[PDB]
Design an enzyme around this catalytic site. Structure first.
Site, PDB file in Angstrom:
ATOM      1  N   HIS A  96       0.818  -1.217   0.000  1.00 33.91           N
ATOM      2  CA  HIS A  96       0.000   0.000   0.000  1.00 33.91           C
ATOM      3  C   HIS A  96       0.855   1.271   0.000  1.00 33.91           C
ATOM      4  O   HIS A  96       1.911   1.324   0.630  1.00 33.91           O
ATOM      5  CB  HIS A  96      -0.920  -0.001   1.218  1.00 33.91           C
ATOM      6  CG  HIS A  96      -1.908   1.126   1.236  1.00 33.91           C
ATOM      7  ND1 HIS A  96      -3.006   1.168   0.404  1.00 33.91           N
ATOM      8  CD2 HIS A  96      -1.963   2.252   1.987  1.00 33.91           C
ATOM      9  CE1 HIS A  96      -3.694   2.271   0.643  1.00 33.91           C
ATOM     10  NE2 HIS A  96      -3.083   2.946   1.598  1.00 33.91           N
ATOM     11  N   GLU A 417     -46.098 -10.074 -12.946  1.00 37.59           N
ATOM     12  CA  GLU A 417     -46.559 -11.229 -13.683  1.00 37.59           C
ATOM     13  C   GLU A 417     -45.513 -11.700 -14.698  1.00 37.59           C
ATOM     14  O   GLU A 417     -45.610 -12.798 -15.256  1.00 37.59           O
ATOM     15  CB  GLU A 417     -47.884 -10.908 -14.370  1.00 37.59           C
ATOM     16  CG  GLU A 417     -48.458 -12.096 -15.111  1.00 37.59           C
ATOM     17  CD  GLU A 417     -49.969 -12.226 -14.989  1.00 37.59           C
ATOM     18  OE1 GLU A 417     -50.550 -13.016 -15.784  1.00 37.59           O
ATOM     19  OE2 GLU A 417     -50.564 -11.555 -14.105  1.00 37.59           O
ATOM     20  N   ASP A 512     -60.030 -22.113  -7.373  1.00 35.73           N
ATOM     21  CA  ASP A 512     -59.226 -23.282  -7.052  1.00 35.73           C
ATOM     22  C   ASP A 512     -58.802 -23.320  -5.588  1.00 35.73           C
ATOM     23  O   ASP A 512     -57.625 -23.511  -5.281  1.00 35.73           O
ATOM     24  CB  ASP A 512     -57.990 -23.355  -7.963  1.00 35.73           C
ATOM     25  CG  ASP A 512     -58.351 -23.582  -9.445  1.00 35.73           C
ATOM     26  OD1 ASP A 512     -59.398 -24.218  -9.722  1.00 35.73           O
ATOM     27  OD2 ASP A 512     -57.574 -23.143 -10.335  1.00 35.73           O
ATOM     28  N   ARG A 602     -46.215 -15.421  -4.855  1.00 37.97           N
ATOM     29  CA  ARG A 602     -45.548 -14.264  -5.435  1.00 37.97           C
ATOM     30  C   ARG A 602     -45.044 -13.341  -4.342  1.00 37.97           C
ATOM     31  O   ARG A 602     -45.841 -12.700  -3.675  1.00 37.97           O
ATOM     32  CB  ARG A 602     -46.538 -13.516  -6.326  1.00 37.97           C
ATOM     33  CG  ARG A 602     -46.016 -12.241  -6.911  1.00 37.97           C
ATOM     34  CD  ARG A 602     -47.094 -11.546  -7.703  1.00 37.97           C
ATOM     35  NE  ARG A 602     -47.418 -12.270  -8.918  1.00 37.97           N
ATOM     36  CZ  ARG A 602     -48.511 -12.054  -9.643  1.00 37.97           C
ATOM     37  NH1 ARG A 602     -49.391 -11.130  -9.269  1.00 37.97           N
ATOM     38  NH2 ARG A 602     -48.723 -12.762 -10.745  1.00 37.97           N
TER      39      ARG A 602
HETATM   40  O1  LIG Z   1     -50.778  -6.204  -9.259  1.00 32.87           O
HETATM   41  C1  LIG Z   1     -50.231  -7.340  -9.527  1.00 32.87           C
HETATM   42  O2  LIG Z   1     -49.052  -7.589  -9.174  1.00 32.87           O
HETATM   43  C2  LIG Z   1     -50.807  -8.208 -10.665  1.00 32.87           C
HETATM   44  O3  LIG Z   1     -52.238  -8.234 -10.491  1.00 32.87           O
HETATM   45  C3  LIG Z   1     -52.971  -8.988 -11.480  1.00 32.87           C
HETATM   46  O4  LIG Z   1     -52.813 -10.424 -11.482  1.00 32.87           O
HETATM   47  P1  LIG Z   1     -53.205 -11.384 -10.227  1.00 32.87           P
HETATM   48  O5  LIG Z   1     -52.691 -10.859  -8.928  1.00 32.87           O
HETATM   49  O6  LIG Z   1     -52.819 -12.763 -10.654  1.00 32.87           O
HETATM   50  O7  LIG Z   1     -54.810 -11.528 -10.175  1.00 32.87           O
HETATM   51  P2  LIG Z   1     -55.975 -10.812  -9.305  1.00 32.87           P
HETATM   52  O8  LIG Z   1     -57.150 -10.555 -10.214  1.00 32.87           O
HETATM   53  O9  LIG Z   1     -55.355  -9.644  -8.598  1.00 32.87           O
HETATM   54  O10 LIG Z   1     -56.379 -11.904  -8.218  1.00 32.87           O
HETATM   55  C4  LIG Z   1     -55.408 -12.767  -7.617  1.00 32.87           C
HETATM   56  C5  LIG Z   1     -55.935 -14.185  -7.575  1.00 32.87           C
HETATM   57  O11 LIG Z   1     -57.072 -14.261  -6.682  1.00 32.87           O
HETATM   58  C6  LIG Z   1     -57.944 -15.286  -7.123  1.00 32.87           C
HETATM   59  N1  LIG Z   1     -59.314 -14.769  -7.184  1.00 32.87           N
HETATM   60  C7  LIG Z   1     -59.614 -13.602  -7.837  1.00 32.87           C
HETATM   61  C8  LIG Z   1     -60.859 -13.127  -7.932  1.00 32.87           C
HETATM   62  C9  LIG Z   1     -61.934 -13.843  -7.329  1.00 32.87           C
HETATM   63  O12 LIG Z   1     -63.127 -13.532  -7.377  1.00 32.87           O
HETATM   64  N2  LIG Z   1     -61.559 -15.001  -6.677  1.00 32.87           N
HETATM   65  C10 LIG Z   1     -60.296 -15.517  -6.573  1.00 32.87           C
HETATM   66  O13 LIG Z   1     -60.070 -16.562  -5.991  1.00 32.87           O
HETATM   67  C11 LIG Z   1     -57.475 -15.757  -8.497  1.00 32.87           C
HETATM   68  O14 LIG Z   1     -56.868 -17.014  -8.399  1.00 32.87           O
HETATM   69  C12 LIG Z   1     -56.517 -14.645  -8.899  1.00 32.87           C
HETATM   70  O15 LIG Z   1     -55.500 -15.107  -9.782  1.00 32.87           O
HETATM   71  C13 LIG Z   1     -52.617  -8.481 -12.889  1.00 32.87           C
HETATM   72  O16 LIG Z   1     -53.141  -9.370 -13.863  1.00 32.87           O
HETATM   73  C14 LIG Z   1     -51.112  -8.348 -13.101  1.00 32.87           C
HETATM   74  O17 LIG Z   1     -50.874  -7.673 -14.319  1.00 32.87           O
HETATM   75  C15 LIG Z   1     -50.509  -7.535 -11.990  1.00 32.87           C
HETATM   76  O18 LIG Z   1     -49.109  -7.395 -12.176  1.00 32.87           O
END
Ligand SMILES: O=C(O)[C@H]1O[C@H](OP(=O)(O)OP(=O)(O)OC[C@H]2O[C@@H](n3ccc(=O)[nH]c3=O)[C@H](O)[C@@H]2O)[C@H](O)[C@@H](O)[C@@H]1O
Ligand SMILES: O=C(O)[C@H]1O[C@H](OP(=O)(O)OP(=O)(O)OC[C@H]2O[C@@H](n3ccc(=O)[nH]c3=O)[C@H](O)[C@@H]2O)[C@H](O)[C@@H](O)[C@@H]1O
Ligand SMILES: Nc1ncnc2c1ncn2[C@@H]1O[C@H](COP(=O)(O)OP(=O)(O)OP(=O)(O)O)[C@@H](O)[C@H]1O
Ligand SMILES: Nc1ncnc2c1ncn2[C@@H]1O[C@H](COP(=O)(O)OP(=O)(O)OP(=O)(O)O)[C@@H](O)[C@H]1O
Lengths: 639, 216, 101, 110
Positions: A96, A417, A512, A602
């Protein structure tokens, strides 16, 4: 002994030579590209290498192959770390350029001049986890002459080093060395100096300033100042105790060129205006136009889809600050109408697929573009794949291109997503792999579309200098996340859809089983992080991909449903809506149709956010639930 | 998956900072758009996925001089110019090489679309039987080259050498460690089955290109 | 190689597509029925010239660091083997006075 | 010129420009109709007004010499191409055009 050396530049050559003359056998030398260490190695017939990162497994493996007794580091620039250091039984020593533990940082040759030290030296210490901390094996003092400058002291140090090694190197070859540990409570550390660190502030003493020009004199960049808009460099200085009632920074005379300093005056013996040639002070005075006289709008943000969930909240945030001018276009305006009277808000009702004159003109006119126009409600991915593709992908690619055409900064909204069904516990912007399902699972058309856009923006950044920042929201929610009406068609995100159920008295279905989880982020947290990105403090967000979510708010959709229900039952307006129809498990196909597939978990990595924005989510999920529920319930007309 | 399945396998690419996947992702988006057009607008289609098809005319020695060619044809350029055959990242990664003759036959069947059995179908076309590492490809190629009639026209072998992918593809490269296709769909829709063995493809390809070099 | 040795750009040649620079040379009256341009040995790195051979003492492949010939030989992939369509003119208005002529 | 015309009563002034700091003082004038635009983008407005007005004064240009050598192509495209387009709108709609030439057209005349 047998060794592997890491050298570069001057110290590197004298080091390799000392090592040779001392009878060592050099198995290999690691250096850098650009006295040349390589040429020397080449001339001596010593295998020389210059990888970018010797810490890589292959190299570590190869260096281990050579089986060295001891390792030496003579001014090697990249950092050698533990992994390899301990491959030498005799240890690893570094040379150094300072009297450790003082000036243990970097650029000691300059720093000691800056602070006007009266002495310095070279130290050969052992390499440990901590930088320049290892036990000292040998040291040697050097007197810094009052008329010494970086280059002249550099040779002083080189000569010293040549002598220190000459005698303490044979010592190591046997075993006669004392690891005199370092007085940790005396160590001083300094960091990389940028050319901006050689700026002259005439208010300081002439002494201080004089040491500056010496510290970085040629061949170094040199000390500089300004004459109005003009930048000049001082190569030769000279302190004048000769007082001057003249205020600091003002020109006392032009021959010699004497500037008045906080204490005494500094004489500019030689320097150069701009990138001009060097000349005597008196001439530099003229070429700068000197005589006895002293030396040395808001940001336009364009938001497309400004009336949206992210849009309206971001607008509210920006409008709070005074240094922002917000320009926005959107099909709707109910969320931003409250801002229509704001002087710094310029809204216009338009369609990204029709109103080109406005859109292009504003990308051209503004400073940052936030293309928030999209369709982000999952049901639409399977229901209207082509509408999604055209709006989310094609329409936006057009804006991305307006941005590169007019060289504008674009803060593009990616999505969580994009990670798809990634398996990592934490979805990492820079390391996680992206996983989607078969083409017969159209729900991924959105994910893949957004990903291709991220990649194109990335190529434009790399191959055409586009300034960008991609941000990925993780299930942001709060007021205005869609609306109860769109929810009647499934065109809304989970939280807002479940609220419609409670409102209309229909059961909350858990697609589901609803055991899949997500990390819900409060819109307030999200907008704060985004705001930071617009601010782009220190340009720490350029070319960066940043997740924005609260990893702490992880919950299954079933839990979301329960938390929502709990709040709903306690809500003042509860009696206005029908009795709960209960939770009911449903096949995804009966809600999203054929071709739906989902994400079981997620959670985001929020390192990048922390690193680039010094951001950290704060609001807890339950609070977001309450906010959201309240907003929408008070959206329902009761009569 | 051990077998990349057209109707069930998940698609996995790397981070956005690994631009080699720009191709993969682009082709996937197109497959999805065609699919949507099929479902939502009656487009009659068939998507086919070749698995490392090779044989005569797979690129050309000249493009290979710029790295703009697939492996087999690139290695041939090496043997031809006397430069070493580099095995990106050890060359242990494998692929299933398919003879262009087998590929074209399957494709031909698809055009024929007998019984419309290919409508809306996604069909892989490859020979799962010709799985080999790039290293093994390099050896088989070398073996043939040494026995070739024109061998004496080209310089001595400069040997195999492991190289960092970055030094050949640049920053942002990432690769596929293994690739084997499911050829069920092909069997079901085309009654097709790969036949030609890899070694034969190697010979055909090598011969074609060596006789492409002007010697004078 | 002497005429343009460092600090000058230096003498260069090619190994296939690869360009390398010779910094240190050394003439060898030591014959070699080897045709000019072919590599006589890789340690020392001896190249057969039209008259005698030339020994590459030190050089660098591309923009890499300088190294002794033997090493330069490896980094280039050398063993005992040799070192180192028509123009389309579009005329618009081709039938004219200047054009047809 | 706007200030001048706005003094007379028999004039109605329609104007477009990238900037507006010099004409903002007239924004409240009943006979002044300003709109912030770019001759290379806002075609609907420009064409419609050449069609609607009686005289056209295409004053958009770059007339600072340093730019001639520093950005010759930007000068050519704006000063020449963009204006040639306006000149043609004028002949299309048979309108009077008071085009601003320049003393520089004489060059080093003797
Ligand atoms: O903000 C986020 O990070 C993401 O949110 C959404 O995607 P996602 O979270 O998969 O879907 P949502 O509609 O927010 O609902 C989440 C999960 O809840 C469940 N769900 C939704 C609605 C319902 O009546 N019942 C139910 O069980 C579904 O399995 C659904 O995939 C958007 O599609 C994405 O583009 C976005 O990036
Ligand atoms: O026909 C195929 O199935 C695929 O072939 C190529 O992709 P890939 O097989 O990954 O790459 P090649 O250039 O064919 O070579 C295979 C691997 O060999 C290795 N390689 C290649 C060249 C070389 O000199 N050395 C070497 O080790 C590389 O790791 C390379 O990825 C195309 O990029 C795909 O579009 C195509 O679908
Ligand atoms: N053709 C279009 N032209 C203009 N604006 C449009 C068009 N199509 C959609 N939009 C707008 O885009 C806005 C933003 O979309 P939205 O608020 O639904 O989601 P988001 O805030 O992006 O959600 P997330 O942050 O969860 O992705 C909508 O308010 C809508 O007005
Ligand atoms: N619209 C057009 N499209 C294609 N060719 C054209 C068109 N207008 C003119 N030409 C051609 O351009 C050709 C060249 O012009 P011409 O021979 O008259 O003069 P020239 O050879 O350029 O003369 P000089 O060398 O004296 O300038 C003509 O032969 C004519 O066919």
């Amino acid at each position: 002994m047998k060794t592997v050396v890491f050298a570069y530049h001057d110290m590197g050559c004298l080091g390799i030579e000392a090592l040779l003359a001392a009878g060592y056998e050099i198995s290999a030398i690691f250096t850098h590209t650009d006295g040349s260490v390589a040429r020397l190695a080449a001339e001596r017939g010593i295998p020389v290498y210059a990888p970018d990162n010797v810490n890589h497994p292959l190299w570590v493996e190869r260096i281990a192959q050579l089986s060295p007794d001891v390792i030496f580091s003579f001014y090697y620039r990249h950092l050698i770390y533990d992994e390899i250091l301990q491959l030498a039984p005799a240890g690893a020593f570094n040379l150094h350029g300072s009297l450790l533990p003082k000036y243990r940082g970097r650029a000691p040759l300059n720093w000691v001049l800056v602070n006007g030290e009266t002495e310095t030296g070279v130290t050969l210490h052992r390499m440990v986890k901590r930088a320049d901390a290892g036990a000292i094996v040998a040291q040697l003092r050097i007197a810094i002459a009052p008329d010494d400058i970086a280059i002249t002291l550099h040779h002083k140090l080189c000569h010293a080093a040549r002598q220190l090694l000459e005698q303490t190197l044979p010592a190591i070859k046997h075993g006669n060395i004392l690891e005199i540990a370092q007085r940790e409570n005396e160590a001083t550390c300094f960091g990389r100096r940028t050319p901006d660190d050689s700026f002259l502030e005439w208010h300081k003493p002439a002494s201080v300033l004089h040491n500056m020009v010496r510290a970085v004199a040629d061949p170094w960049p040199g000390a500089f100042s300004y004459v109005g808009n003009q930048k000049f460099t001082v190569w030769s200085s000279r302190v004048h105790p000769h007082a001057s009632k003249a205020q600091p920074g003002s020109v006392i005379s032009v021959a010699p060129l004497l500037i008045a300093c906080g204490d005494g005056a500094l004489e500019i013996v030689t320097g150069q205006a701009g990138d001009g040639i060097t000349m005597q002070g008196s001439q530099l005075a003229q070429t700068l136009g000197l005589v006895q006289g002293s030396r040395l709008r808001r940001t336009r943000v364009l938001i497309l889809g400004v009336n949206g969930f992210i849009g309206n909240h971001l607008t509210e945030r920006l409008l709070r600050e005074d240094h922002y001018e917000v320009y926005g276009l959107d099909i709707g305006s109910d969320a931003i109408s409250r801002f229509l009277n704001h002087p710094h808000f310029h809204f216009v009702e338009g369609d990204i697929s029709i109103h080109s004159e406005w859109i292009e003109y504003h990308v051209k006119k503004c400073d940052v573009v936030l293309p928030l126009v999209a369709i982000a409600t999952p049901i639409e991915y399977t229901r209207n794949p082509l509408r999604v593709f055209e709006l989310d992908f094609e329409e936006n690619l057009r804006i991305i291109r307006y941005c590169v055409k007019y060289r504008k900064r674009i803060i593009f909204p990616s999505t969580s997503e994009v990670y798809g069904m990634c398996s990592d516990k934490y979805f990492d912007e820079d390391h996680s792999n992206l996983i989607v399902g078969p083409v017969n699972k159209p729900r991924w058309i959105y994910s893949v579309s957004k990903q291709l856009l991220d990649r194109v923006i990335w190529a434009y950044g790399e191959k055409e200098g586009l300034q960008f920042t991609l941000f990925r929201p993780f299930n942001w929610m709060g007021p205005r996340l869609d609306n109860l009406n769109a929810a009647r068609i499934g065109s809304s995100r989970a939280i807002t859809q479940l609220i419609l159920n409670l409102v209309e008295g229909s059961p909350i279905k858990l697609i589901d089983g609803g055991k899949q989880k997500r990390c819900f982020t409060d819109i307030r947290d999200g907008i704060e992080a985004l705001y930071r990105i617009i601010e782009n403090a220190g340009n720490r967000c350029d070319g960066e991909i940043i997740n924005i979510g609260n990893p702490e708010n992880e919950a299954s959709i079933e839990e979301l449903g329960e938390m929502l229900l709990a709040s709903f039952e306690k809500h003042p307006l509860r009696h206005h809506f029908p009795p709960f129809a209960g939770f009911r498990v449903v096949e995804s196909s009966s809600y999203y149709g054929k071709g739906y597939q989902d994400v079981e978990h997620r959670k985001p990595s929020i390192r990048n956010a922390h690193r680039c924005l010094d951001w950290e989510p704060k609001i807890d999920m339950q609070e977001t639930i309450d906010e959201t529920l309240d907003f929408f319930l008070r959206t329902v007309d009761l009569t």
